[PDB]
Amino acid sequence: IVAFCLYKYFPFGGLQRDFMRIASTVAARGHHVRVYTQSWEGDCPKAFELIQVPVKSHTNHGRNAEYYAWVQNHLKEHPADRVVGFNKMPGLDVYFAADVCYAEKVAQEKGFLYRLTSRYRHYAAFERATFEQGKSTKLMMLTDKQIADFQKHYQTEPERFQILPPGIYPDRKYSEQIPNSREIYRQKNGIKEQQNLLLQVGSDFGRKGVDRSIEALASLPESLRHNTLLFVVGQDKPRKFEALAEKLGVRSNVHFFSGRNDVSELMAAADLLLHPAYQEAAGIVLLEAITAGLPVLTTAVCGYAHYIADANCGTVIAEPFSQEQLNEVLRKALTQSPLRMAWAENARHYADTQDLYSLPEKAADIITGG
Ligand SMILES: O=c1ccn([C@@H]2O[C@H](COP(=O)(O)OP(=O)(O)O)[C@@H](O)[C@H]2O)c(=O)[nH]1
Numbered sequence: 001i002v003a004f005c006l007y008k009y010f011p012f013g014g015l016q017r018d019f020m021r022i023a024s025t026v027a028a029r030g031h032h033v034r035v036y037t038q039s040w041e042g043d044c045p046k047a048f049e050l051i052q053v054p055v056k057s058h059t060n061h062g063r064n065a066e067y068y069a070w071v072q073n074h075l076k077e078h079p080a081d082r083v084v085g086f087n088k089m090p091g092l093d094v095y096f097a098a099d100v101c102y103a104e105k106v107a108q109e110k111g112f113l114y115r116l117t118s119r120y121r122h123y124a125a126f127e128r129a130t131f132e133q134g135k136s137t138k139l140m141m142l143t144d145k146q147i148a149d150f151q152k153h154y155q156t157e158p159e160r161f162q163i164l165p166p167g168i169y170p171d172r173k174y175s176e177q178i179p180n181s182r183e184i185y186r187q188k189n190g191i192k193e194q195q196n197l198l199l200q201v202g203s204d205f206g207r208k209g210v211d212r213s214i215e216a217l218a219s220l221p222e223s224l225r226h227n228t229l230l231f232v233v234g235q236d237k238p239r240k241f242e243a244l245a246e247k248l249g250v251r252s253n254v255h256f257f258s259g260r261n262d263v264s265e266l267m268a269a270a271d272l273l274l275h276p277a278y279q280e281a282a283g284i285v286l287l288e289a290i291t292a293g294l295p296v297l298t299t300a301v302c303g304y305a306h307y308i309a310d311a312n313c314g315t316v317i318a319e320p321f322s323q324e325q326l327n328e329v330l331r332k333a334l335t336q337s338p339l340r341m342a343w344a345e346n347a348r349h350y351a352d353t354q355d356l357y358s359l360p361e362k363a364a365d366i367i368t369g370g
Pocket residue numbers: 011012013014015017201202203204233234235258259260261262263282283284285286288
């Protein structure tokens with residue numbers, strides 16, 4: 001019996017999609033998968049034993065504490081062979097690091113008033129419980145930067161870390177698309193031949209720099225701008241970003257969608273992925289774009305940004321972030337067809353020659369070992 005803990009399941013988040021693939025791989029190996037969550041949105045595999053954990057606190061952190069306590073009591077009466085968490089909390093045998101190091105985020109970005117809060121104390125305590133010395137929890141990591149951050153703040157025993165390769169779903173790959181996918185999916189989405197389709201995918205618009213993408217779109221010269229659309233796709237509220245697009249005179253250029261299950265089709269249709277995130281532990285969409293043959297504009301703060309430079313299929317904007325640099329990079333990318341075509345070919349080559357896929361199998365090996 002392998003118990004999986006994540007606070008919330010929904011289909012449009014990276015943590016959630018990594019969990020789904022890892023848990024499915026574990027179940028397919030013949031183990032019984034139990035899932036504890038506060039809420040589950042979308043389809044659930046029939047094989048999984050899904051337990052909805054009741055909570056009543058009015059804060060996220062209060063609910064998370066309630067969840068931890070409830071699951072401990074349930075495990076007491078209904079023991080599991082291994083406990084795997086996708087969120088930081090006490091009691092885990094294995095943790096999957098979908099998130100950034102909180103202690104480092106706070107140290108770099110927050111001040112005294114932020115550290116006064118019960119919320120800060122909770123998230124710090126639950127991260128500490130997972131990473132501190134003396135714990136047995138195995139720590140499945142996505143980047144070297146994560147490891148460096150956790151070592152800085154917790155001095156975690158190095159042997160407990162294991163970096164995993166990416167786990168991009170093969171359905172995004174250019175070679176897994178129907179013939180004429182670019183034409184068919186552009187037509188399906190109302191995209192004309194002469195139009196430049198910019199695509200931004202992710203369920204946290206603020207964190208992922210949707211504002212920076214809209215600013216970049218608005219900065220384009222008039223004729224080019226008239227021919228350029230931005231699709232913003234994710235389970236988040238568009239309001240603030242609609243207001244910004246209106247301010248900048250590009251509301252009609254920007255199309256907002258809730259969570260979509262056809263991202264593979266949008267990537268086949270698109271001309272560039274824009275992902276100028278403020279914060280991103282890894283960024284699955286960056287590598288999905290690589291596999292789709294879709295060139296990428298992103299920011300150096302993203303854990304997976306280096307892959308864009310490695311694949312030579314776009315531009316990574318350096319810190320400190322310069323909007324003017326993003327603006328010019330966008331203008332160049334849209335005006336220089338040979339550059340964009342070379343990037344696209346480079347992406348396809350990298351997707352065909354690199355391991356961007358084995359995460360679920362390697363994670364399942366760690367989880368089921370012994
Ligand atoms: O509307 C959406 C939004 C996101 N995703 C998928 O959700 C994952 C997002 O992971 P990422 O690491 O990019 O961002 P996170 O959600 O973890 O911040 C990727 O597989 C996306 O393709 C999706 O299918 N539809």
